[PDB]
Amino acid sequence: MIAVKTCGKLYWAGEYAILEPGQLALIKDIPIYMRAEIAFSDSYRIYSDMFDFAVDLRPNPDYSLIQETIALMGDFLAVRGQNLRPFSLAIYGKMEREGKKFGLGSSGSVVVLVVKALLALYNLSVDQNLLFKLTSAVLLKRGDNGSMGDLACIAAEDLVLYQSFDRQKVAAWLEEENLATVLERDWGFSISQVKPTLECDFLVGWTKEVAVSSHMVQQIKQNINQNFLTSSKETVVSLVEALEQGKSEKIIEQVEVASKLLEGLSTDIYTPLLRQLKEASQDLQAVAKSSGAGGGDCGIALSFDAQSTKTLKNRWADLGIELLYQERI
């Protein structure tokens, strides 16, 4: 057996705006892993601990995302002169607790995970951009309403500055042209590392209220206007520059602008608990905001001194917020 793993992700800035082609988002990798075990066998067997039953390749709704990923990979392997053969695949480490997902991008992680598993099983490797394209193709083919930012971050497993591409356009290419031709074209996206140059604690507060990404996007996308898109893009650029220049005060400023833009976009993004999560940092050398589609899941914080981190943690503790993850940037 060969084992592989994929991380999770959490947006720092650029949410919603990133849905429009050419926009920017700053996305952070989270080392909480989805894991897989794969080996050739005499029949196809696929099991994910998110469910209480296994399936083979015959279509099943619970497993459709995984099966569609395998199907796309069957085509990729063909391009590379390889034929799909029966294998047993086990997926575990579901990014949920007590039946509730954390909000770490499990959908995107499992697609990258399965692509990684089949590549490893077939002794093949692909670079970062190709991995992103292969995993993105799966979501594009099923008409996903996401920006693919989660795939960009998980593929890179780093804090990345992601520039979105036109998903409707690439999906059209995939429906009309052979996969190799589509993969070889420049899609027009960008994924690059952002390395902060100052010390700081990164905290993740889980509100334990599940928020469905596709539902949030479906209802809030109509609220997106140009003023928001322009402001968001500038804010992501300024935040990246602040992190790279190591200026705490400018980071606090831009994260606050990002948060206010989200609040203005929709009253559904900030739930009372997500709002309390960011309010807990208002008088500290730290800053916080909702992360992702909002409507539940997690909030993130960046703290610039020991005292601020201690107080922020105590406040979140008293607020019923679970400290899901913490890291010294």
Ligand X SMILES: C[C@@](O)(CCOP(=O)(O)O)CC(=O)O
Ligand Y SMILES: Nc1ncnc2c1ncn2[C@@H]1O[C@H](COP(=O)(O)OP(=O)(O)NP(=O)(O)O)[C@@H](O)[C@H]1O
Binding site for ligand Y (CB under 6 A): 34, 48, 50, 65-66, 91, 94, 101, 103-107, 110, 150, 213, 292, 297
* In the complex, minimum distance from the CB of residue 96 to ligand X, in angstroms, rounded to a whole number: 14
Site for ligand X in 192-221 (CB under 6 A): 213, 217
* In the complex, minimum distance from the CB of residue 70 to Mg ion, in angstroms, rounded to a whole number: 25
- Quick count: other Cβ atoms within 10 Å of Cβ 46? 21
Partners of 38 in the β-ladder: 2, 89
Residue closer to ligand Y by CB (options 101, 289) is 101
Contact letters for Mg ion, residues 88-117 (x by CB under 5 A)? ---------------x--------------
CA distance 125 to 128: 10
CA distance 284 to 267: 25
CA distance 79 to 181: 10
Q: Among residues 4, 7, 8, 16, which is the contact residue for ligand X, using CB under 6 A?
A: 16
Q: Does 118 bind ligand X (CB under 6 A)?
A: no
The residue range among 38-46, 230-238, 284-292, 315-323 that interacts with Mg ion, by the rule CB under 5 A, is 284-292
Contact 218, 301 (CB under 8 A): no
CA–centroid distance for 236 within its chain: 16
**Alpha helices of 53-199 — where are they, by DSSP H?**
64-79, 106-121, 128-141, 149-156, 167-176, 179-184
Paired tokens of 73: 């990979």
Contact 262, 17 (CB under 8 A): no
User: Is 297 marked as binding a ligand?
Assistant: yes
Contact 240, 258 (CB under 8 A): no
Residue closer to ligand X by CB (options 250, 275) is 275
Position 215: which residue type? H
CA distance 146 to 161: 17
Residue closer to ligand Y by CB (options 66, 239) is 66
* In the complex, minimum distance from the CB of residue 83 to ligand Y, in angstroms, rounded to a whole number: 25
Q: Tell me the CA distances in angstroms from 30 to 6, 149, 296, one per residue in order.
A: 10, 14, 18
* In the complex, minimum distance from the CB of residue 210 to Mg ion, in angstroms, rounded to a whole number: 9
The residue range among 13-21, 126-134, 182-190, 259-267 that interacts with ligand X, by the rule CB under 6 A, is 13-21
Q: Does 292 bind Mg ion (CB under 5 A)?
A: yes
Nearest residue relative to ligand X (C-beta): 292
Q: Does 293 bind Mg ion (CB under 5 A)?
A: yes
The residue ranges that bind ligand X (CB under 6 A) are 11, 15-16, 18-19, 103, 105, 146-147, 149-150, 213, 217, 292-293, 297
Binding site residue list for Mg(2+): 297
The residue ranges that bind Mg ion (CB under 5 A) are 103, 292-293, 297
